[PDB]
Amino acid sequence: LLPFRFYVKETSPNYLETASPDALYGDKEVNGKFDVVVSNPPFSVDLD
Amino acid sequence: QLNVTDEQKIAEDNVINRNKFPLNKLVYTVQALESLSFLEGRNSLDGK
Amino acid sequence: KNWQRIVEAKLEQQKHKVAEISLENGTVNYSKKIKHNRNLKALTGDEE
Numbered sequence: 537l538l539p540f541r542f543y544v545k546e547t548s549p550n551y552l553e554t555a556s557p558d559a560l561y562g563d564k565e566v567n568g569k570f571d572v573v574v575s576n577p578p579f580s581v582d583l584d
Numbered sequence: 585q586l587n588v589t590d591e592q593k594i595a596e597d598n599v600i601n602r603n604k605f606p607l608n609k610l611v612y613t614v615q616a617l618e619s620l621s622f623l624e625g626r627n628s629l630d631g632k
Numbered sequence: 633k634n635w636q637r638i639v640e641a642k643l644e645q646q647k648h649k650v651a652e653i654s655l656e657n658g659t660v661n662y663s664k665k666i667k668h669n670r671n672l673k674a675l676t677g678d679e680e
Contacts, residue, residue, distance in 0.1 A: 544587060544664055589664070592647055 540567055636678065653680075 540555040555565040588594050600610055626632045643651060651662035658675020674680075 541664065541668070546587060591649055 539565060 540553055543550065543552040545553070551569045552567065554567060554569065556568075557563050558566040558568075637655075640653060640655075643653065649663070650666075651660070653660045653675065658680070660673055660675045660680045662673075
């Protein structure tokens with residue numbers, strides 16, 4: 537849950553590094569490069 | 585491999601915790617785990 | 633006079649390694665947690 541600049545891969549193209557504000561979404565960063573997102577989010581995360 | 589840059593974190597750590605991992609076990613593991621490549625060793629006779 | 637060279641003393645004696653500069657082939661590098669705009673990060677005079 538960090539900005540895409542943190543994900544730095546020291547080799548090959550880094551698709552999870554680009555970012556750009558989106559017009560019709562809160563003027564916030566949107567990667568918009570992947571096609572399928574499969575995941576199982578944590579049931580109850582508390583952060584800090 | 586882990587893409588960490590903090591010198592303090594990468595220097596103030598260790599592969600095994602010592603007191604929770606006896607050195608004899610470390611020697612046995614480190615020397616038994618060889619004789620097979622963990623990169624290309626997969627051949628499964630014929631079929632990988 | 634020696635400010636250009638005494639700055640390196642404090643900037644390198646630190647442990648957090650936020651930034652670091654070289655007298656030769658200036659790469660004026662700093663942490664990825666800082667924005668990395670203009671993409672060059674080369675020593676362009678005393679301004680850098």
